[PDB]
Amino acid sequence: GMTTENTTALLLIDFQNDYFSTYNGAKNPLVGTEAAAEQGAKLLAKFRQQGLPVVHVRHEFTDEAPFFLPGSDGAKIHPSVAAQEGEAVVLKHQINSFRDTDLKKVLDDAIKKLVIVGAMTHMCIDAVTRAAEDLGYECAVAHDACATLDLEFNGITVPAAQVHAAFMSALSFAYANVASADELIAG
Numbered sequence: 785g786m787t788t789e790n791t792t793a794l795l796l797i798d799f800q801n802d803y804f805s806t807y808n809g810a811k812n813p814l815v816g817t818e819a820a821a822e823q824g825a826k827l828l829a830k831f832r833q834q835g836l837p838v839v840h841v842r843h844e845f846t847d848e849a850p851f852f853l854p855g856s857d858g859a860k861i862h863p864s865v866a867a868q869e870g871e872a873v874v875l876k877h878q879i880n881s882f883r884d885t886d887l888k889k890v891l892d893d894a895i896k897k898l899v900i901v902g903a904m905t906h907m908c909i910d911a912v913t914r915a916a917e918d919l920g921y922e923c924a925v926a927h928d929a930c931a932t933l934d935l936e937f938n939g940i941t942v943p944a945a946q947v948h949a950a951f952m953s954a955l956s957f958a959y960a961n962v963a964s965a966d967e968l969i970a971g
Contacts, residue, residue, distance in 0.1 A: 790834070790835055790836055790837070791837075791894075791895055791896035791897060792836065792837070792895070792896070792897040792898065792899060793836070793837035793838065793839050793891060793894060793895045793897070793898055793899070794827055794828065794831045794836065794837070794838045794839070794898075794899045794901070795839050795840075795841065795881075795898050795899065795900050795901070795902075795912070796824060796828070796838070796839070796840050796841065796861075796865055796901050796902050797841045797881060797900065797901070797902030797903065797908050797909060797912055798841060798842060798843050798902050798903050798904075798908055799817075799820075799821050799824060799861055799862050799864070799865045799901075799902050799903060800842060800843065800852060800858070800859055800860060800861055800862060800903075801857060801858050801859070801860055801861075801862050802851040802852055802858040802859065803817045803862075803903050803904075803931065804817045804818060804821070804862055805817065805818075806818055807858070807862070809858065810858065811850060811851035811852075811853075811858050812850065812851035812852075813933075814903055814904060814931045814932060814933045814944070815931060815932065815933050815934065815944035815945075816931050816944070817903065817931045818864075819928070820901070820903070820928065820929050820930055820931040821862060821864040821865050821929075822864065823901070823926060823928045823929035823964075823965035824864075824865050824901040824902070824926070824929040824965070825864050825865050826929075826965050826966070826969060827899065827901060827926060827929060827965050827968065827969060828865055830969050831899075832868070837894045837895060838867075838868075838871045839871065839872050839873075839874065839887075839890060839891065839894075839895075840861060840867045840871060840872065840873040840874065841873075841874045841876060841881045841885075841887065841902070841912075842859065842860075842861055842873055842874065842875055842876070843859070843875075843876050843877070843908075844859050844875060844876075844877060845877065861873070872890050874886055874887050874890060879907055879908055879911050880908075880911040880912065880915050881908065881911065881912040881915070882912070882915050882916075882919070888919070891921075895921070896921065896922065897921055897922040897923070897924070898916055898921050898922070898923050898924070899924045899925075899926060899968055900912060900913055900916075900923060900924065900925045900926070900930075900960070901925075901926050901929035901930060901965075902929070902930060902931075903930060903931045903932070904930075904931065904932045904933065905930045905931060905932035905947065905948045905951045905952070906932050906935065906947050906948075906951050907932075909925065909930050909932075909951070910951055910954075910955065913925055913955050913959050913960050914955075914959055917959040917960065922961075923959060923960035923961070924960055924961040924962070924963060924968060925952070925955055925960045925961070925962045925963075926963065926964065926965045926968050927948075927952045927962050927963065927964065928964055928965055929965050930948070930952075931944075931948075932944050932947045932948050932951070933947070934947070935947050
């Protein structure tokens, strides 16, 4: 029946204080989070400037959790990308943002497509993008609006830029349109 073309939601995954090295006492600082958030904020402003849907996702762990302690300031969304009234915030406890959360029900109450930003590239961004595309959403990922960190495995240390590049490459075309905040803004 009568439809809008405005079925793309901006989905911000866990831009939470513990991820920012500029946040005093951050328990899980990532590489380049501030810059990533700067780009996410750019996108945030564009969506609100249009009629478009904006959905936030936030993670909490137990009080002896390593980071994102439940109820802590460290688990609060960073002010550079803070939520506004009307914009749903989904609280999650698993890596995948659809798992045991209301995310689907939420999207299904507004959404056809997603623009994905947030953290961490190799963990929660990978998970939500692949889960979403498999569920049927057309996904894009603003690559300069996500963040990760340096990884090590069995003696090999992969710097964050390379972690990010591998995951973004993996997601590009197979699962999502991977493009700049500015490129996505331009359209």
